[PDB]
Design a protein around this motif. Structure first.
Motif, short mmCIF file in Angstrom:
data_model
loop_
_atom_site.label_atom_id
_atom_site.label_comp_id
_atom_site.label_asym_id
_atom_site.label_seq_id
_atom_site.Cartn_x
_atom_site.Cartn_y
_atom_site.Cartn_z
N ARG B 299 -1.93 -4.13 20.01
CA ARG B 299 -2.26 -4.17 18.83
C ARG B 299 -2.58 -5.82 18.34
NH1 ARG B 299 -0.90 -4.32 13.24
NH2 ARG B 299 1.46 -3.77 13.57
N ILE B 300 -3.53 -6.45 17.64
CA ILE B 300 -4.25 -8.06 17.42
C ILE B 300 -4.34 -7.69 16.31
CG2 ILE B 300 -3.67 -8.23 20.05
CD1 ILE B 300 -6.68 -8.15 20.27
N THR B 301 -4.97 -9.55 16.27
CA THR B 301 -5.24 -9.68 14.81
C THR B 301 -5.85 -11.13 14.70
OG1 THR B 301 -3.23 -8.90 13.23
CG2 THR B 301 -4.61 -10.83 12.61
N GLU B 302 -6.83 -10.67 15.31
CA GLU B 302 -7.65 -11.78 15.31
C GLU B 302 -8.20 -12.26 13.94
OE1 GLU B 302 -11.32 -10.95 17.73
OE2 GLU B 302 -11.67 -9.15 16.89
N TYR B 303 -8.34 -13.97 13.96
CA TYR B 303 -9.11 -14.14 12.63
C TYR B 303 -10.47 -14.65 12.95
CZ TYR B 303 -4.43 -14.86 10.70
OH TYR B 303 -3.06 -14.56 10.36
N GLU B 304 -11.57 -14.81 11.94
CA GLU B 304 -12.88 -15.06 11.62
C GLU B 304 -13.50 -15.84 10.79
OE1 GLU B 304 -15.37 -15.67 13.63
OE2 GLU B 304 -15.81 -13.22 14.54
N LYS B 305 -13.57 -16.46 10.95
CA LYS B 305 -14.49 -18.02 10.22
C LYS B 305 -15.90 -17.59 9.82
CE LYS B 305 -15.16 -22.35 10.40
NZ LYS B 305 -14.41 -23.53 10.95
N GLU B 310 -14.30 -19.41 5.13
CA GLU B 310 -12.95 -19.16 5.01
C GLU B 310 -12.73 -18.05 6.71
OE1 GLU B 310 -15.97 -19.15 2.90
OE2 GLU B 310 -15.04 -19.69 1.55
N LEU B 311 -10.96 -17.89 6.89
CA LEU B 311 -10.28 -16.97 8.13
C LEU B 311 -10.07 -16.24 7.52
CD1 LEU B 311 -8.81 -20.10 9.32
CD2 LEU B 311 -10.64 -19.71 10.32
N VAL B 312 -11.20 -14.86 7.75
CA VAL B 312 -10.53 -13.89 7.19
C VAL B 312 -9.85 -12.63 8.41
CG1 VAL B 312 -13.11 -13.60 7.40
CG2 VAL B 312 -11.45 -10.96 6.68
N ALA B 313 -9.18 -12.35 8.12
CA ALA B 313 -8.01 -11.53 9.70
C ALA B 313 -8.43 -10.24 9.54
CB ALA B 313 -6.99 -12.08 9.15
N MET B 329 -1.96 -15.88 22.90
CA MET B 329 -1.28 -16.43 21.54
C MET B 329 -0.90 -17.30 21.18
SD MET B 329 3.24 -15.81 21.59
CE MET B 329 3.38 -16.78 23.07
N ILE B 330 -1.98 -18.40 22.02
CA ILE B 330 -2.02 -19.52 21.93
C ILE B 330 -3.22 -20.14 22.06
CG2 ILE B 330 -0.43 -19.77 24.37
CD1 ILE B 330 -2.74 -20.59 25.37
N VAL B 331 -4.28 -19.58 21.84
CA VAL B 331 -5.39 -19.54 21.51
C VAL B 331 -5.75 -20.06 19.61
CG1 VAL B 331 -7.75 -18.20 20.98
CG2 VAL B 331 -6.94 -18.28 22.77
N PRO B 332 -6.19 -20.50 19.30
CA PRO B 332 -5.82 -21.19 17.50
C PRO B 332 -6.92 -20.02 16.45
CG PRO B 332 -7.21 -22.58 18.74
CD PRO B 332 -7.06 -21.87 20.14
N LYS B 333 -6.16 -19.98 15.76
CA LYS B 333 -7.34 -18.94 14.43
C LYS B 333 -8.76 -19.57 14.63
CE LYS B 333 -2.42 -20.17 12.54
NZ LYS B 333 -1.31 -18.50 13.30
N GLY B 334 -9.64 -18.30 14.96
CA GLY B 334 -10.65 -18.84 14.58
C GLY B 334 -11.82 -18.31 15.51
N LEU B 335 -10.74 -18.02 16.33
CA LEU B 335 -11.69 -17.37 17.70
C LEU B 335 -11.62 -16.24 18.41
CD1 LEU B 335 -12.08 -20.24 18.73
CD2 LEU B 335 -11.14 -20.05 20.92
N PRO B 336 -12.49 -15.69 18.14
CA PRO B 336 -12.62 -14.05 18.61
C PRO B 336 -12.19 -13.65 20.09
CG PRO B 336 -14.44 -14.95 19.52
CD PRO B 336 -14.50 -15.73 18.23
N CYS B 356 -14.65 -23.42 21.51
CA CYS B 356 -13.19 -23.63 20.72
C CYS B 356 -13.69 -24.84 20.14
CB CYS B 356 -11.81 -24.50 21.32
SG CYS B 356 -10.34 -24.76 20.57
N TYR B 357 -14.29 -26.24 21.19
CA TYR B 357 -14.68 -27.13 19.87
C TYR B 357 -15.50 -27.42 19.43
CZ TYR B 357 -16.02 -32.44 19.77
OH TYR B 357 -16.87 -33.34 19.31
N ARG B 358 -16.29 -26.19 19.53
CA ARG B 358 -17.94 -26.63 18.37
C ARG B 358 -17.61 -25.57 17.12
NH1 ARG B 358 -22.08 -28.52 22.08
NH2 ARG B 358 -20.14 -29.94 22.75
N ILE B 359 -16.63 -24.33 17.82
CA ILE B 359 -16.09 -24.35 15.84
C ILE B 359 -15.32 -24.78 15.55
CG2 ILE B 359 -14.93 -21.47 15.13
CD1 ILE B 359 -16.43 -20.31 17.52
N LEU B 360 -14.09 -24.64 15.08
CA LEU B 360 -12.65 -25.56 15.35
C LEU B 360 -13.41 -26.47 15.09
CD1 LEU B 360 -10.84 -23.88 13.81
CD2 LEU B 360 -11.52 -22.32 15.63
N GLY B 361 -13.25 -27.74 15.84
CA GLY B 361 -12.89 -29.49 16.20
C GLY B 361 -12.36 -29.28 16.75
#
Ligand SMILES: C[C@H](CCC(=O)NCCC[N+](C)(C)C[C@H](O)CS(=O)(=O)O)[C@H]1CC[C@H]2[C@@H]3[C@H](O)C[C@@H]4C[C@H](O)CC[C@]4(C)[C@H]3C[C@H](O)[C@]12C
Ligand SMILES: [Mg+2]
Lengths: 66, 552, 1316
Positions: B299-305, B310-313, B329-336, B356-361
């Motif tokens: 059971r995982i929680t993947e955030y999405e912008k 806005e990051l909605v989990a 566990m190391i993937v930043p919040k914002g990737l599918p 990751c570069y295109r989405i987060l920065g």
DNA sequence: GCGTCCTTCGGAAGAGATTCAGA
DNA sequence: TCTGAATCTCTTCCAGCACACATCAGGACGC
RNA sequence: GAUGUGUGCU
């Protein structure tokens, strides 16, 4: 071609430093050409800031002061 | 310049001037002596030839030489050519505050750090040390500080750590092909004599660790330091200027680690169990209760912008492995989550970093790259992905194919003596049937290598993708390709002659069995041509880039 | 059976193919060539004798005076090799020649001579070659590599393709002589033959045709066969050859004797030709108009007025033929000018040629060769006689004439060195035939067209050059000399010959510095075949073809050993069995194959003789008789591989190793490697450094024995005997009585070479391997040199490797070395380096070597003695003082930065005139004492042996042993004995004793004079002090460490013992490699070597376990026999039943660290044998074992490979490459930092890095890079003051290299200046 | 020992000088 | 027999950095 | 300082 398009530039220093130094300097001396230190290789040779990056602002100020 | 002894340096300009002045003085002497016109004419000719030799030697028919028939360099010979004042002393200069030493890995670093040897940074940042010693009053003059530094007291190391804290240095490899060959790193003092280099930037530098050296330069002025940090720092060079692909991509060991971690087999220490989070998955794996290649439902929680920043989990329950859950566990919040739930090769990791570069920065991308490198090295070491001699499994239906192909070759050879086929089409068809046997052997090899791994479902047998280490590091894209595995386990191929005539009998032996005394000699032609092509045909490809730079 | 050097540690062999030719003396080219150059030839063909008889006897300008050579002699060298190396002078020998000047009586050219004056005159000084094929030039040891140049002769090249820009392929015929000018013949796109002398300019071949005293009709007779036209009643019938009409179009109705054969315009078929031949006719009709396009052969003049009607090479026109018809010339000569077969090339050249007579042809040649000079008849005649027909200005050698005659298909092989008419005519005829279609060109990469010029031939040529230089002056001076006072030395100057020979041996492109850091490097440098140098090609104008490996390199030149870089494929290495032909070509051994029996007699076939026979393959199965078991075997007939029958073969290869060189025959499992990786492995094996304790390779090739023994670094016994006294620096052998000569028997002493400096600053140090009282046999190793173990080349250590990724510390190609490796000092090597402190006498006075230094305290002067020289044995570090040298107003010699050391040698050379310094005379006294003591000790030992021989004579024929001891030692030679030959032996031994006394006395006097000499030096130096440091470079992160299969790497972390992975026995792993370096670069030989070494170490561990707990010889003998009988079928076949139940125990003690395995190059160990050997111990058959992590203590969840790979240690040490530079020293012409690490120099910011800085836009960084830390002077010092002022700010001006450019342009006629 | 002096061998391309042929 | 087109001949170019070693500097003649 | 040779990484 990229060879002739570099040999036939406006600034004789770039053509002299690239290829066929004798044939470029002789023609420039006969024609009495006058360099302007326009590009990047000329400013690298002379020892100034290149008009490329962080020195572009300085070169713009220098050009707009005259 | 006077050397040891009464003699002097073999200067050429001075020798040419000596010749010219001698001839000119002789001509002036003969002008007053009223010499016969033939002699003075000859001497004027010799003076003209000497002056033409001084101006541009060798432009006439034969060039004059000083000793041992070596044509001495005139004034033009030191303005033109590759060894002239333009390309040797003006467009490129020898540079102070520079260093040079061998490089090692040291994977404990970060993307913005390198390791300078403690006995090298003392020599590089020496005037800074003098300035700080005079500021602190430990020394009095430049001479006293210089003596104190060369004596290497107990406090100069405590001062070197202050001049080097946030003062980047430029690490440059020898062939600076593209602009990523010069990058700036914040130094980290280490004990040793090798400049440690972050493993990610080796792709950009094209710097292996088999004995190559890098040059370290010190930005002196304030503007140079700010340019090194804002423009040339390695954390600001994650994107190749040639194309939009990332350039700090994991290479050949992080790729193997993330491919071994993010892959499933149909069996496990614990398979059907359902997990309640990536942290619990890591706790389960590190405790030895479930294999890294299980098939669980975590059971995982993947955030999405998907909103306007806005990051909605959104939490769900996906069918993944333990290894993928650990990696998430190391993937930043914002990737599918549909970015690690596969078998990560090298293209997959490159696309992961690109997204990751295109989405987060940029900052999350650097953090993600460091975390990927760490978790790839760790779970590659914990795998022990060796390579033995049993891994290169030769397909059993190889000598059968060889016998069939040789029977066909013998039949065609016999038909040649019957006059039906000449020395043309017969050669063509025998080459083509040898190639047909080659592709059949390679296909049999690559069908026995990957899918031919029967594993038990605990109800019955079924197949999967192989854990054969050769195939593992070939499929992951770490190192190797189809050609190398074909030449190791299948047959080597058709090694042609240097002129262009493809050898009639291709090498039927690989580097898992032996090679004959003659097949090796056949392979040596191609190997020597491939080695000589680099050495004596990278000159034209390095002249092309010089012309391209000078035209633009 | 095996000897004592073999029954001590016998290496298990896996070779299946039996051997028939043992590996020859590896350096048999250098020694044989210099032996040919230096020996005494009565007839005279080789070396100095031929070079002397080429020039001498020499005669003046008809001055009735001749200087004639008689004989030559080489005096003994002034110093030996060791003294030459210590001093710094060449190892040479005087050249004494018995010259004789003779003058006949006046008005009697052949009558009685006035007098005979002769004296041995010293001219020249030829360096001698040491026992190992290495010269000594200035203490440094040089090696004269061989040269591979195109053989003298004629080479018909092609110049195919790109010429003419239309596809027409020309043809050229180059005539290369051994000495003299070239004679390039070549064609023209307009089908014209152009001679080209020395590539000057084109001109028709008719010019040299006429220059050879030939008329036009003679030229046409030579090149063309006539077609006969006869004038008759009318219609001008033709004499017809039926074969001539083959392959053309019938110009008319071909008929004979009325009947018609070929119609109009029909192509004549061969059937019609044969039928015309069977018609037995010779004359047919021909239309007159058809002869409009023909040429006349000979000149035709009128029979009435004598006026010329048709000159030679003139066309037949209808009006001209009509004029000839009425003239009366019935027989008309024309040329067979076929347009496909017999092309009329030379006729067209005649038309183009503007010359008409021989004299004008000579004038034209003179104008071409030497333009701008007035041509005269005699000058041009002499020039053309000196070009190609004078034995001094042009000389084809014997090999040149052999190639010249064989290329023209002639029968004779010998002949004159100069050319002739027939030679040039035949060359042109062959070229024309090649143009016609018959025959073919010959490639210039064929090894039958490339000779080998070793040291002897090149030295002979260079000496002959100097001899010519001397004889020119001997000719000029003789005509102007006063007789009765000219002994044969006033006219011969020794300066030119000695100068030329020293110029060759010292400064030449082939007098290379010896790459000497282990026996393999020197033994593969001596066997080096270069293509550069004098008479060869440069790396600039080296095409894609010379680099590429030719099919004829098989058995002669190594395919997989050429130095990568600028010169790859030009510096090939000699093959293992490759030999040198009498002419100089390369030939290889081959087993002769009879009707069905592969015999044992061996034939050396050249590269041109090989291309005719069908030669079998080395790995061909035989059955106890020499018969091929299979009917179809693989062979190579004409540079091509195909399957051949068991009867067509007539030669078989000797052994599998004959293709590869010595350096590349040491790699085990070479056949499982790629060729690039094999090349890298060979090169890195050449670059290996010798470690502290040399360790035998567990997996080898059996070639280590030959490389070790035949290198010269180890002391091999000369005569077998018993070790009477073994010392750390001396071995004494008491030879057995069967090996002793009657006169001068005694014993032999081997003086080992202790710690001394090599060329690459490594350490060469021979240490004994035999024990006291151990019987040695002839030709066995007595003391191993650097990197050797019991006469077996051991370049590295057997490291317990494991292929696994480990936390990224072996990321790309790095190695992760366990700390146990550095604890055990397995890789810590010695580096002896010499530091010199010369003392010149500049202005204001000379320089002193006093121990007092101004402005320096006594703390830095503590190490020095009272004389300014450091004590031997000081633990001097970087920055200390070695020699205190003061300059008249300090310039003392200091140890360089960051290098430790331990002084182990101080040698002071003082020029004569200065008395001494007290330290120098202390050194001299110590040397005198040592030179007396060692000579006295050797005399005592060898006279103890001599008195033992005396007593052994005395025991036969009336021995009184009861009274023998009490006699005083002097009165032993004349004891009671009969007057048989025993008393003769006693008297001979007494004479030997007395002669040895006298010789030792005079040798001691000579040694006194040599040590107390003046030691001449360079002009303007007082004394020279050399201090020899000796560092122990341990292993550390940064230095290259490499295997044998081209898997190099730089150590990234010296990991502690506990962190290394360990197996279930807890044994750590010494090295952790990277698995991913195996598949991409397919050097699979490393993994097979790993498995085989694991098996070998398993056998060694079983032996060590059975030997640790005391077990009887039975179990050990059984296990060792099982181990040695493991292979399916091997030629080792060693039986321990013949061992003396103690030799097996010593063998087991030597094997307890691992049984050495021999795996021949292409006769290797198969995988089944490896797995069976692994199963012989208790190791898994798969090779991979279970490893546990060292830190977490948990198992790696996959079986990993663990074994013993043989790791080298290349001398690319990190401490010799680390360098940094702050504000230091700057250049002179342009104010830039110096270049290099020797001087304190900064790394070059190249032209490519400026582009990378421009790409970022970093302008300020670039501006500081090319001004403020560079050519700028004022800005540089201002920046330095700012940096040590707390201010990071630059104020650049202009680089001084731009002012240099401005001045260098203004020095021409140009005026470049800056504009306001 | 000090000291004063008069070979040849690549190949690819481009420019710029000569020669052809053709109307 | 004037003038484009083809051909002949001469020039320029052939990567980047680094390390190690050696040899050289006029040598021929007058004193 | 220039040549000559050898070598390392591309
Ligand atoms: C007679 C002898 C072979 C025996 C049959 C012939 C065949 C090849 C000849 C040598 C080679 O030409 C190379 C060399 C040429 C130089 O000039 C100096 C002499 C050399 C050694 C020649 C001497 C002699 O002539 C040789 C050995
Ligand atoms: Mg590299």
């Amino acid at each position: 071609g990229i060879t002739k398009a570099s040999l036939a530039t406006e600034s004789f220093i770039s053509a002299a430093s690239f290829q066929e130094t004798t044939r470029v300097l002789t023609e420039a001396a006969v024609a009495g050409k006058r360099d302007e230190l326009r590009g990047l290789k000329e400013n690298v040779i002379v020892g100034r800031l290149i008009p490329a990056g962080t020195g572009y602002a300085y070169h713009q100020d220098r050009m707009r002061r005259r | 310049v006077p050397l040891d002894g009464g003699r002097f340096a073999t200067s050429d300009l001075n020798d040419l001037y000596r010749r010219v002045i001698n001839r000119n003085n002789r001509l002036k002497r003969l002008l007053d002596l009223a010499a016969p016109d033939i002699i003075v004419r000859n001497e004027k000719r010799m003076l003209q030839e000497a002056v033409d030799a001084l101006l541009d030697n060798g432009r006439r028919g034969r060039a004059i030489t000083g000793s041992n028939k070596r044509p001495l360099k005139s004034l033009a010979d030191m303005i033109k050519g590759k060894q002239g004042r333009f390309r040797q002393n003006l467009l490129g200069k020898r540079v102070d505050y520079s260093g040079r030493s061998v490089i090692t890995v040291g994977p404990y670093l970060r993307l913005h750090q390198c390791g300078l040897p403690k006995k090298m940074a003392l020599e590089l940042f020496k005037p800074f040390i003098y300035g700080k010693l005079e500021l602190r009053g430990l020394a009095t003059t430049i001479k006293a500080a210089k003596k104190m530094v060369e004596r290497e007291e107990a406090v100069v190391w405590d001062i070197l750590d202050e001049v080097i804290r946030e003062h980047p240095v430029l690490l440059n490899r020898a062939p600076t092909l593209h602009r990523l060959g010069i990058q700036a790193f914040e130094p980290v003092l280490i004990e040793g004599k090798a400049i440690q280099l972050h493993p990610l930037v080796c792709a950009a530098y094209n710097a292996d660790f088999d004995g190559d050296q890098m040059a370290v330069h010190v930005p002196l002025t304030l503007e140079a330091q700010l340019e090194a940090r804002a423009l040339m720092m390695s954390t600001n060079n994650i994107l190749s200027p040639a194309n939009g692909e990332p350039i700090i991509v994991p290479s050949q060991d992080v790729v193997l680690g993330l491919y071994y971690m993010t892959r499933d087999c149909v069996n496990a220490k614990g398979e059907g169990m359902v997990l309640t989070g990536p942290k619990e998955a890591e706790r389960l794996y590190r405790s030895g209760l479930a294999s890294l290649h299980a098939r669980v439902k975590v059971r995982i929680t993947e955030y999405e912008k998907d909103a306007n920043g806005e990051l909605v989990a959104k939490t769900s329950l996906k069918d993944t492995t333990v290894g993928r859950a650990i990696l998430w566990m190391i993937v930043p919040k914002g990737l599918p989550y549909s970015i690690v739930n596969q078998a990560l090769g090298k293209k997959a990791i490159s696309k992961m970093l690109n997204t990751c570069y295109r989405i987060l920065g940029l900052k999350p991308t650097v953090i993600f790259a460091d975390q990927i490198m760490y978790t790839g090295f760790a779970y590659a070491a914990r795998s022990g992905a060796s390579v033995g001699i049993d891994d290169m499994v030769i397909p059993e239906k190889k000598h059968e194919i060889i016998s069939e192909a040789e029977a066909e070759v013998a039949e065609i050879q016999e038909q040649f003596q019957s006059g039906l086929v000449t020395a043309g089409e017969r050669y063509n068809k025998v080459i083509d049937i040898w190639a047909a046997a080659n592709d059949r052997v390679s296909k049999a090899m690559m069908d026995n290598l990957q899918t031919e791994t029967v594993i038990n479902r605990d109800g019955q047998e079924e197949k999967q993708v192989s854990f054969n280490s050769i195939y593992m590091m070939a499929d992951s894209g770490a190192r190797g390709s189809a050609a190398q595995i074909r030449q190791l386990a299948g047959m080597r191929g058709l090694m042609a002659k240097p002129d262009g005539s493809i050898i009639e009998t291709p090498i039927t032996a690989n580097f898992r069995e032996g090679l004959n005394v003659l097949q090796y000699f056949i392979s040596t032609h191609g190997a020597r041509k491939g080695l000589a092509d680099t050495a004596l045909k990278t000159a034209n490809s390095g002249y092309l880039t010089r012309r391209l730079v000078d035209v633009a | 059976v095996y000897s004592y050097t073999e029954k001590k540690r016998i290496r298990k062999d896996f070779g299946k193919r039996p051997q028939v030719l043992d590996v020859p003396y590896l350096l048999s080219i250098q020694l044989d060539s210099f032996q040919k150059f230096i020996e005494q030839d009565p007839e005279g063909q080789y070396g100095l004798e031929a070079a002397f008889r080429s020039v001498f006897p020499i005669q003046s300008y008809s001055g009735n005076s001749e200087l004639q050579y008689v004989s030559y002699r080489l005096g003994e060298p002034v110093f030996d090799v060791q003294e030459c190396q210590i001093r710094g002078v060449t190892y040479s020998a005087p050249l004494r020649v018995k010259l004789r000047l003779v003058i006949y009586e006046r008005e009697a050219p052949e009558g009685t001579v006035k007098d005979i004056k002769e004296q041995e005159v010293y001219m020249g000084e030829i360096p001698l070659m040491t026992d190992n094929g290495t010269f000594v030039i200035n203490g440094t040891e040089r090696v004269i590599v061989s040269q591979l140049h195109r053989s003298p002769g004629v080479f018909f090249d092609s110049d195919k393709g790109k010429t003419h820009s239309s596809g027409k392929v020309l043809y050229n015929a180059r005539i290369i002589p051994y000495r003299g000018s070239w004679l390039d013949f070549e064609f023209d796109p307009k089908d014209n033959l152009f001679v080209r002398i020395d590539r000057r300019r084109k001109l028709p071949a008719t010019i040299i045709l006429r220059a050879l005293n030939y008329t036009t009709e003679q030229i046409l007779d030579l090149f063309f066969e006539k077609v006969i036209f006869e004038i008759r009643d009318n219609k001008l019938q033709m004499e017809l050859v039926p074969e001539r009409l083959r392959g053309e179009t019938a110009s008319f109705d071909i008929e004979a004797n009325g009947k018609v054969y070929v119609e109009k315009g029909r192509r004549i078929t061969a059937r019609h030709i044969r039928q015309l031949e069977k018609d037995d006719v010779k004359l047919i009709e021909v239309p007159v108009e058809y002869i409009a396009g023909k040429v006349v052969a000979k000149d035709y003049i009128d029979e009435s007025t004598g006026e010329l009607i048709c000159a030679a090479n003139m066309e037949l026109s209808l009006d001209l033929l009509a004029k000839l018809s009425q003239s009366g010339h019935k027989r008309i000569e024309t040329l067979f000018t076929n347009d496909l077969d017999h092309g009329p090339y030379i006729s067209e050249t005649l038309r183009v040629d503007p010359t008409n007579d021989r004299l004008s042809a000579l004038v034209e040649i003179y104008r071409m060769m030497r333009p701008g000079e007035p041509p005269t008849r005699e000058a041009a005649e002499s020039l053309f006689e000196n070009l190609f027909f004078s034995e001094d200005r042009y000389d084809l050698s014997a090999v040149g004439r052999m190639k010249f005659n064989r290329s023209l298909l002639r029968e004779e092989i010998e002949g004159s060195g100069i050319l002739s008419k027939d030679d040039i005519i035949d060359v042109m005829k062959k070229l024309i035939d090649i143009r016609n279609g018959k025959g073919e060109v010959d490639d210039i990469d064929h090894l039958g067209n490339r000779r080998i010029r070793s040291v002897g031939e090149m030295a002979e040529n260079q000496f002959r050059v100097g001899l010519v230089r001397v004889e020119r002056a001997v000719k000029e001076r003789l005509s102007l000399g006063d007789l009765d006072t000219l002994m044969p030395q006033d006219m011969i100057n020794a300066k030119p010959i000695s100068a030329a020979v020293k110029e060759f041996f010292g400064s030449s492109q082939l007098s290379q510095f010896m790459d000497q850091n282990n026996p393999l490097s020197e033994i593969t440098h001596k066997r080096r075949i270069s293509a550069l140098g004098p008479g060869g090609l440069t790396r600039e104008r080296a095409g894609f073809e010379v680099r590429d490996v030719h099919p004829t390199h098989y058995g002669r030149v190594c395919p997989i050993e050429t130095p990568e870089g600028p010169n790859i494929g030009l510096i090939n290495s000699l093959s293992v069995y490759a030999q040198t032909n009498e002419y100089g070509f390369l030939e290889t051994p081959y087993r002769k194959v009879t009707d069905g029996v592969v015999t044992d007699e061996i034939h050396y076939l050249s590269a041109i003789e090989e291309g005719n026979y069908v030669i079998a393959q080395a790995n061909s199965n035989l059955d106890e008789e020499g018969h091929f078991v299979e009917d179809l075997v693989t062979c190579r007939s004409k540079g091509e591989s195909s399957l051949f029958s068991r009867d067509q073969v007539d030669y078989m290869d000797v052994s599998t190793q004959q293709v590869v060189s010595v350096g590349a025959s040491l790699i085990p499992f070479l056949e499982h490697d790629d060729a690039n990786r094999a090349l890298m492995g060979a090169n890195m094996q050449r670059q290996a450094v010798p470690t502290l304790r040399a360790d035998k390779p567990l997996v080898g090739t059996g070639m280590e024995r030959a490389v070790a023994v035949d290198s010269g670094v180890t002391a091999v016994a000369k005569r077998g005997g018993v070790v009477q006294y073994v010392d750390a620096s001396r071995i004494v052998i008491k030879v057995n009585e069967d090996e002793m000569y009657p006169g001068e028997a005694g014993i032999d002493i081997y003086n080992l070479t202790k710690y001394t400096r090599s060329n690459q600053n490594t350490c060469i140090n021979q240490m004994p391997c035999v024990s006291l009282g151990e019987p040695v046999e002839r030709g066995d190793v007595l003391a191993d040199g650097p990197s050797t173990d019991l006469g077996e080349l051991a370049l590295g250590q057997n490291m317990r490797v494991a292929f696994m990724p480990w936390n990224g510390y072996n990321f790309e190609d790095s190695i992760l070395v366990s700390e146990r490796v550095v604890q055990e000092d397995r890789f810590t090597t010695i580096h002896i380096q010499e530091l010199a402190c010369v003392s010149r006498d500049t202005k204001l006075g000379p320089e002193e070597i006093t121990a007092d230094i101004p402005n320096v305290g006594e703390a830095a002067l503590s190490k020095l003695d009272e004389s300014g020289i450091v004590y031997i044995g000081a633990e001097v570090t970087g920055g200390d003082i070695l020699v205190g040298k003061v300059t008249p107003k300090d310039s003392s010699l200091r140890v360089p930065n960051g290098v430790s050391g331990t002084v182990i040698d101080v040698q002071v050379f003082t020029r004569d005139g200065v008395e001494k310094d007290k330290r120098a005379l202390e050194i001299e006294e110590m040397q005198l004492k040592q030179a007396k003591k060692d000579l006295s000790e050797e005399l005592q030992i060898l006279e103890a042996g001599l008195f033992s021989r005396i007593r052994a004579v005395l025991v036969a024929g009336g021995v009184e042993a009861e009274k023998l001891d009490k006699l005083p030692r002097d009165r032993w030679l004349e004891l009671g004995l009969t007057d048989e030959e025993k008393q003769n032996q006693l008297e001979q031994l007494a004479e030997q004793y007395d002669e040895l006394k006298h010789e030792f006395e005079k040798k001691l006097e000579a040694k006194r004079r040599k040590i107390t000499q003046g030691d001449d030096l360079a002009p303007g130096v007082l004394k020279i002090v050399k201090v020899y440091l000796a560092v122990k470079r341990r292993i550390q992160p940064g230095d290259k460490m490499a295997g044998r299969h081209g898997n190099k790497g730089v150590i990234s972390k010296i990991n502690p013992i506990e962190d290394m992975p360990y197996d279930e026995n807890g044994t750590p792993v010494d090295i952790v490699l990277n698995p991913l370096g195996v598949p991409s670069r397919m050097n699979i030989g490393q993994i097979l070597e790993t498995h085989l070494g694991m098996a070998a170490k398993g056998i060694g561990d079983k032996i060590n376990a059975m030997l640790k707990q005391q077990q009887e010889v039975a179990k050990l003998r059984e296990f060792i026999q099982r181990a040695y009988d493991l292979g399916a079928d091997v030629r080792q076949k060693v039986d321990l039943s013949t061992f003396s139940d103690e030799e097996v125990m010593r063998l087991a003690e030597n094997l307890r660290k691992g049984m050495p395995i021999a795996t021949p190059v292409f006769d290797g160990a198969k995988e089944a044998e490896i797995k069976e050997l692994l199963k012989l111990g208790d190791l898994p058959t798969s090779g991979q074992i279970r490893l546990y992590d060292g830190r977490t203590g948990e198992q790696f969840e996959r079986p990993v490979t663990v074994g013993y790979m043989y790791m080298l240690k290349l001398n690319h040490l990190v401490d010799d490459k680390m360098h940094a530079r702050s504000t230091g020293s700057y250049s002179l012409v342009t104010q830039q930092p110096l270049g290099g690490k020797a001087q304190f120099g900064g790394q070059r910011f190249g032209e490519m890095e400026v582009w990378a800085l421009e790409a970022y836009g970093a302008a300020y960084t670039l501006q500081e890079m090319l001004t403020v830390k560079s050519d700028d002077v004022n800005g540089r010092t201002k920046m330095y003051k700012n940096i040590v002022d707390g201010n990071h700010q630059m104020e650049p001006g202009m680089p001084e290299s731009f002012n240099v450019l401005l001045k260098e342009i203004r020095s021409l006629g140009i005026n470049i200046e800056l504009e306001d």
